[PDB]
Amino acid sequence: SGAIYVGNYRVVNRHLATHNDWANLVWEDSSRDLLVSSTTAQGCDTIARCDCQTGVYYCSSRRKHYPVSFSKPSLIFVEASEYYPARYQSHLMLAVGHSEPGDCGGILRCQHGVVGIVSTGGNGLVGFADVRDLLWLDEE
Ligand SMILES: Oc1nnc(-c2ccccc2)o1
Ligand SMILES: [Zn+2]
């Protein structure tokens, strides 16, 4: 689990978005596994505006941050895990790393701020849903 809090936005994995996320829906993309909902409290996270391919992600299944090299956001086919079926996903970045189902929502960050959140796992790979192209997160 985990979210990004920037301005009056909460960013979550679409598949973990709560009833309260959906009630206050701003934006969702089923092809990206992202959902943004409205918050009343002004958030403190900064979104990275960069093309870094290096950063640090939080892995709850190891209670550790790992430094990783990651691919540029792409359209990538995601294979079936234990709890979720397979499918395609856009704006997806892969790294060599540990990722289990409950790891979704762990933040990937570089010196410029938040890059993405954990979205996919399995086969010694971690997938991050990129948020750096959502410029609108940095006002109103
Ligand atoms: O599956 C699901 N998650 N949230 C909702 C919801 C939220 C508000 C009103 C109706 C439904 O539905
Ligand atoms: Zn960066």
From Swiss-Prot:
The active site is at H15 (for protease 2a activity), D33 (for protease 2a activity), C104 (for protease 2a activity). Zn(2+) 1 binds at C50, C52, C110, H112. Coiled coil: none annotated. It catalyses: Selective cleavage of Tyr-|-Gly bond in the picornavirus polyprotein. Cysteine protease that cleaves viral polyprotein and specific host proteins. It is responsible for the autocatalytic cleavage between the P1 and P2 regions, which is the first cleavage occurring in the polyprotein. Also cleaves the host translation initiation factor EIF4G1, in order to shut down the capped cellular mRNA translation. Inhibits the host nucleus-cytoplasm protein and RNA trafficking by cleaving host members of the nuclear pores. Counteracts stress granule formation probably by antagonizing its assembly or promoting its dissassembly. Homodimer. This is Protease 2A. It comes from Coxsackievirus A16 (strain G-10). The chain holds residues 869 to 1008 of 2193 of the full protein.
